[PDB]
Amino acid sequence: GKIQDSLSSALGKLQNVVNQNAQALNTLVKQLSSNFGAISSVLNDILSRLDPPEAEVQIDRLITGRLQSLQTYVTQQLIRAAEIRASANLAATKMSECVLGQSKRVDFCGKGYHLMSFPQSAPHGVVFLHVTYVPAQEKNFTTAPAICHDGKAHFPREGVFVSNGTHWFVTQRNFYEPQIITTDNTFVSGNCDVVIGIVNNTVYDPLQPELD
């Protein structure tokens, strides 16, 4: 609902390519009224006040100037089209990678974590609406890399060990959701004297009580 307000109330990149092309086409026509060193700018005025041997010299001065101006127009259009081409090549890649997929590239389909994208057509281009996830409202906790228990070192399978001040849990790294540390969400490797930062805490076995 806010995209609609912010637009209804920004398309400068599309306006600039229209303006540049019109400014060049006008400069092309406004050159049809320069002498380039001749008696006038009209061929019906050199063909009316000069005999054919003298009007050749004056017509050539116009021909040279007008050819120069047309060829300048055609060079600058090649250079402007090579730039529009790269923009369209980027738009074609964003349509593939943000609209028909989910991208992992950072800051390619918005700012945040890309969820999805929607295309909309514009006069000579395309608008992408990028939907991203942004995390909010953070707290600090204290962490450890591993937990020592029974002389073994335990590491989280897919999370982080955190402490609310007195107790130790596992969360997932992007959203706070604490769990009891068990042998189902941790794994073991080694003894607890080579890691630096290990803390002492109990790792709960689910079978051990339940069975008994």
Binding site: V106, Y113, V134, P135, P145, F155, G197
Partner: protein
């Protein structure tokens, strides 16, 4: 300046050149567009950060040593050990050179903030609000991203930090 390069002072030249139309207005527009694009190039590469982040006064980074690439407080430019090495290795007839909008003090200040964001928050400052994490734990997250299990980092921390330091 098209007129001052061509004619140049003389006045018999200016009235004759006035007969060519807008050839000189086009050239000045072309050169001005180029100069405006050079500042946008630099804004797009370097001003990729919301805040100007600072490193804490300690340097307890798990045995990793970033001193050759952090800024040097004893300098007017505040560049770092590797940025000082890199900077020692690299009026007319209407011609003029404009200065860039950003000083390179400003550019060095953008780069040091990008560096302190990475060393202190990993990748969280690039997609929301920076969230601190200990370096040795961020290095272990990154070992997971290349498919190595994360005790391989914690059991080899000193060796890995020495190899980083020698490569730097």
């Amino acid at each position: 300046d098209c007129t001052m390069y061509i004619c140049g002072d003389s006045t018999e030249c200016s009235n004759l050149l006035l007969q060519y139309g807008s050839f000189c207005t086009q050239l000045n527009r072309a050169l001005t567009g180029i100069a405006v694009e050079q500042d946008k190039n630099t804004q797009e590469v370097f001003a990729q950060v919301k805040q100007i982040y600072k490193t804490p006064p300690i340097k307890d980074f798990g045995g990793f040593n970033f001193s050759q690439i952090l800024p040097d407080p004893s300098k007017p430019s505040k560049r770092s050990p590797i940025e000082d090495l890199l900077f020692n290795k690299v009026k007319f007839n209407g011609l003029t050179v404009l200065p860039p909008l950003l000083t390179d003090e400003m550019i060095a200040q953008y780069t040091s903030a990008l560096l302190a964001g990475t060393i202190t928050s990993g990748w969280t400052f690039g997609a929301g609000p920076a969230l601190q994490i200990p370096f040795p734990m961020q290095m272990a997250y990154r070992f997971n991203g290349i498919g190595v299990t994360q005790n391989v980092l914690y059991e080899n921390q000193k060796l890995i930090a020495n190899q980083f330091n020698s490569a730097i």
